[model samples]
Target: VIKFKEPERCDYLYVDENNKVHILLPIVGGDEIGLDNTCQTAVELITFFYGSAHSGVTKYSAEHQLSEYKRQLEEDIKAINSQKKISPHAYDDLLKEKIERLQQIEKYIELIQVLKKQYDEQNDIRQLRTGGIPQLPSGVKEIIKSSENAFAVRLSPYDNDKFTRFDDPLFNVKRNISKYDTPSRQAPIPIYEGLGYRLRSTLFPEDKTPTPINKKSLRDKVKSTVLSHYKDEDRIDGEKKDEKLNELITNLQNELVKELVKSDPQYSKLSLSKDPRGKEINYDYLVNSLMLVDNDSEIGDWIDTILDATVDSTVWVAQASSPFYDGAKEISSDRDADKISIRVQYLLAEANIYCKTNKLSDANFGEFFDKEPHATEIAKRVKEGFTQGADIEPIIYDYINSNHAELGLKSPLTGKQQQEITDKFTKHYNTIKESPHFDEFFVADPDKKGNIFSHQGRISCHFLDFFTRQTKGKHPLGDLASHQEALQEGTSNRLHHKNEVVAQGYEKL
Candidate 1:
């Protein structure tokens, strides 16, 4: 589907089924004359109806040749077989031998016809070669030679399409599936009951809404908004609860640090320089380790603590679920291994700050990355955490809290109001978000003519604690692209190397 073209179509003809190729035609088709079949890969199908075609054509060709040579024979086959005249018995015997010899010639001709059919079929690569052929059906040759256009029927092994391009929606429908796979970066999740307007619905009707919003200054507003609701909650959790939360956070922080040291031994040291390796790692990947888990044991407390945070709720997947870290797994990738250390350092620093907070329970310490306990921590962590994109988890979680936490006077919106507002404003937010700045925006690539809808999407997931949950089902890593686009773009980022594809194929591993 990715044009599958560059140098020339003849190059494809040279390739074998295994992808190794040999040039058969100095120039296939008109590049030169009379080239033999060398095309490969596209013809994956072994099923063929061409058997009947070969049989019918070859049988007719041989019969016609025999009819033309009838008069030349010393004794006519027709007369001998029919007993047309009263002749000597010995003369009849000689005629019988001649007829048998003619039949042998016919058999050889039929065998030659079959060999020619196989030669042509091998060149076609399973796609219907409806357009060009030197050994065409009887009488079709002159018609083709008269035409100026060059053509060939596209072929496929999985073969649902006749002559399809990969991007042709007609051939595939997974491209347009709306909610499940095609999630907008601007509008993620079933928030506000899946309505993404940034205003109150009851307060303002859907059709004729009035605008009466309260605007606040940005600098003080964010902190003020957070404190309004959580101050009392923090007060209620009290100093003892504060100690408990800090201890738990400390445990996770320690685990992260432990993993980090386990991963990148060099980065584990103190007083590390910017160019620890005389080069910097992709910092975005480094931050991913902060939230991701190295093993089940590593995240058990963190997951358990979240359940502990919410009383009277039990976790169970209603239908089927994928495997979890029921046991330890080896962390092998160097890129992943290195990031583990960086994340642990940041989390540990953040944990220390929470230990001193008076109302840890009330404190949304997870927000503002309170472990370091200062504006610098918030800013530093936000930059590290959010530098990948605005849509990243920490920022999304913060947005839910900052806009809706009910923190202050002249706030962005009350908790309920913000939920309502998101419905309207998210679209607007996305319009701006789509243009530039930062964050991801995903859209599905679809196939239209396809009978079964193809669910082509990005494989997006975020690591929360003991496990990772998919952001959008079968989505791309950070952005959405169609199957056609993905082929050109490559499926690496979303396709984890440790998963089925890379590891299974890695014989050395």
Candidate 2:
């Protein structure tokens, strides 16, 4: 199978000696204060030119496609720039024009870099294609494209036929048998995780009817303090400014809980293939596959029993790399906790979607299974629920209160548990009051669609909490030193940790 080495630390993101953030982009940066589109275009053009020449009969077709893409980009760029030339009366907002210019530049660079990376990787001189190229080196066999981004190269036929160790003059090595060399089955589910943080000053101690008033972030509070103090003092020393920043960051560190939340909304639906390890008890394709068999059937009954226990229940994704695997009955050699975590996260996502569509603040595990849609015979799974309830909790505090008997809630969670859930749901509701129809936690794209998983999403909420402050591998509002380090590294560091399990060949079971 073909394998790829992860990019260099610099290729993703890294922190400088001064603790400043340095994010890796597709283009080179200079004194010009933006991305280098010039180099990016060159990379794209070269990739297209080389890819077209090397491919089989589709050489000219590739050339034509590249030409079309470039032509369209040029026209787009021209049209975008032309808008700037309109008179002051036609379009008076110069600031808006400037912002649009910067956005257009970023988009232009992005379009160029995407094509360059894809074609370059797939059509590189070193890369093998699906069918062997006669003009290429004899060592080049054939490659199978597993997905849009992944590939696998087959073992050469000549190597299998080559002279063996049985004919060796020295110590003999047995023929590499498929029996011993059997690759471990792997789970197909992809888990996206993060620790999102909100401002501390806005939050208050919780109650069943807790209503925390919204306030400015610690950063914002610090900024205003610094600006006001510095301007008044005129000669404010470096130590004074450091003291201000240090105190704010320190207080937040102690107050914040590094609650990890996985944000892979599509995990339940996307990974519906056959089991990787082929284990009978394991939930490789849990809900999707189980639904195939009739509920009255033996297999379906077993699934129903298992899901009944797990559906509304919450489970933790261990923060540490080494985690206890309940199925394997041992701490994994690889970080196998990730596998268990995603299954639970998928269930939570399923629950979250259920609450969104139904008006109920809290729904039972059984509500997700009921089908009511007229267009399809199958149950109406929460397709948009993940995105909708991404900002807020899928099920409210009442879920625990209602299911107290099922959960064995003897004391009824009067302390931290109730508070966390209360803030989690209430924060979203409070924010909406500030701006009409402002349910989105993050405006990720130009269209203002929410990216509820991002750190940027935390800004949308008014009253922030210590618990469930969205985070990647590292917590956002956790330890002062670590949070700064994570901020400096950016989202690239978070993705690296989430993908670490996949990079290694170990499977869930």
Candidate 3:
């Protein structure tokens, strides 16, 4: 094995800071504009003038190829300019054309400088085949005709031993052993996250539905919200679990239960060959690998189960994030209990991710096993599910209610409110759903045509909760001074304890 050094010598051509042409001993940029025919011809000429007499880059064949390329380019240019010669009053495009040709020449000069920095060849004077007076270097002579008698020409550079002659060293970091064979290390994995702000607003005591009516997303929000409520082991609601919530929870449970009792033998069709002797490659090269396929019922159902749980939680947050007034917004007292209830309600929504290899591994014990089986040890990996990591709770509130009465659900706030309603609910919704601890509270459909796991934040829905807590008796954010403007400055900010607020109702944006 040819082991390259930890830091090996290498060179690259790039456009440098000064805008002058230079071969980067370590790095150089490609001609961002491009290497026009002028640059190509210039490089060819320089190679011919200095190449070794034998097999270097500037040999007789190289010269002929370069010459042909140049001739073709010149002919094309002449033809393009000939149209103008026929008529003095053609389009003004020719003026730009002439300037471009001039620039191409400059670019050629830059290329020559780059090549010069890279090569340093020993000069060898040689004679022409047609009885020239002088002779050339022996190495140059040997390469031309290979036949001693015929005065065949030769032109080449560099020795057989040398591939590069640069001043800089290249580095290749090592990782896992097999990883050495292929290099793919760069940048971290990316995420495709979607937003759901509308859901947040709809979860509050003000709004019941997210608006501007995105039909598809609206259905998704409602359907998911109703289905995913079962996964919240944390929500018992003696903690009353109503029949609506129960029905929704059952949907999630049923999907999971269905997967546990399934096993399709068709999946076994992809099994490896079980020949007693070595058959070189056991599986058929094409037909066996192409036509047959397997569908994992458990895997599909598992995904559905997780999605159901996630969608249900999203509904709760939607209600909490809303500014709508509904029956759920009213409480005789129990302010602290309601806050706790609504917060869990918020954590209720999250994405369901079931990472499964689907492929079964088999450890062939050979004669040890009585039954025939595929290669490698078969196993199924199930990803953790229903894990929520957000401070899911109601944030903003409505400014008013339908009957023109003080909006008095068990709010966590202690402040007074006026018309409409405004708060940093935008920031609130985004932050909570994507919180570090809220691992499950993300949005992504892994089954989509494009990568779904990559969808870390793509399906976004912002729900604005217009309701403000009764700050007069309830809560406020962490730091009072950081607020952009306090409607009533220095009034002992009351909506500080988040746990004291409850979700009596919710509205959708």
**Candidate whose TM-score is highest:** 3
Name the regions of candidate 2 deviating beyond 4 angstroms: 1-112, 115-399, 402-412, 434-509
lDDT of 2 by residue, 1-509 (tens): 11222222212122232222222221111111111121121221222224444334433322344344344435544554565656323323322332333343333334334434542343432332332321221111111011111111111110121211111111111112322133532222221111000001011112222222122333233233334333332321244633443343333222222121132223233211123343332232332455432222332233233333322323222222111112233213222222322222222322332232222333332232121221021101111211121112223233334554443334343335443334422332232222211101111111122111111111111001111121112322222324333342333211231223222222211
Candidate 2 vs candidate 3: the TM-score winner is 3
Tens digits of lDDT, candidate 1, 267-345:
2442211223343222222223433222222223333433233212211212111111112132233222222222222
Q: For candidate 3, lDDT tens digit of each residue in 1-509?
A: 11111111111111111221111110011111001111121222222334334244323422243344344435544554565667654534433432343343344333333323432232222121222222322322232113111111010100111111111111111111222133553322221111111112222213222122122123343344443443434332332433333443445444433322222223222211221232322113211343221132222233333343233343223323332122232222233222322232222111001110111111111111111121011100000000111111222111112211221222222222211112322222344432222111222222322111111112210000000111121222222222213211222211111111111111110
Residue 227 local lDDT, model 2: 42
* Pairs in steric clash, model 2: 194-471, 194-472, 195-470, 195-471, 195-472, 196-469, 196-470, 196-471
Worst 10 residues of 2 by lDDT: 195-204
Q: Answer with 2 or 3, whichever has the higher lDDT.
A: 2
